[PDB]
Amino acid sequence: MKLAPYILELLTSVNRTNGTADLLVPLLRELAKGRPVSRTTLAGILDWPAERVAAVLEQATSTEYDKDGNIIGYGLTLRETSYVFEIDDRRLYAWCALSTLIFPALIGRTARVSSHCAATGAPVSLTVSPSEIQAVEPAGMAVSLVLPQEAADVRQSFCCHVHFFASVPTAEDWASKHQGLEGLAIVSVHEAFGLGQEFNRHLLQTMS
Ligand SMILES: [Br-]
Ligand SMILES: [Hg+2]
């Protein structure tokens, strides 16, 4: 299918203000270590004042913090979700299906991803590298997409509708009982991975 409007609206969304793109990649690489990330640690990596770092993060309303005020969730998260995302010996989680497909290229590591079909509850898993996916089980795995909304919180308007399914038929059956959700579409995990690749290329083509 035609992916340009998905890529465009997703890109538009992360350019909240200048900073997000350039903050996003180091933050993900820190979260991938499996521990909470301090605002000062980010500042060291970015060479920004911590208050600039906070100014970027305050625009991102779904950012998760722990009891110590450290960052534990931003696309990748230490707080349990349906999308398990393991790097090395650390279990991490992700906000949605497409996240799991995108973030391995950004952090430069292969991830072991596992979830459950949102229609049937069947387990699903794959290995996601910066350049390819492997071990897709079951092989006909599918992904739901919706159109992101620009000024909406990305987690509540996009991530919460973007799931893994055991198969395209299963997913399409499920989709026929959702309506009004703008841009709802079912694709194979391969097409979603390709989507994530175009997204990343565009997003990286515009950092410092
Ligand atoms: Br188009
Ligand atoms: Hg997402």
Swiss-Prot record:
Molecular-function annotations in GO: alkylmercury lyase activity
Organism superkingdom: Bacteria
Disulfide bonds: none
InterPro entries listed in its UniProt record: MerB (IPR004927), MerB_HTH_dom (IPR024259), MerB_lyase_sf (IPR053717), WH_DNA-bd_sf (IPR036390)
Keyword Lyase included in the entry's annotation: yes
Keywords carried by this UniProt record: Lyase, Mercuric resistance, Mercury, Plasmid
Reaction(s) catalysed by this chain's protein: an alkylmercury + H(+) = an alkane + Hg(2+)
Function: Cleaves the carbon-mercury bond of organomercurials such as phenylmercuric acetate. One product is Hg(2+), which is subsequently detoxified by the mercuric reductase.
Name under which the protein is recorded: Alkylmercury lyase
Lineage, broadest ranks: Bacteria, Pseudomonadati, Pseudomonadota, Gammaproteobacteria, Enterobacterales
Gene coding for it: merB
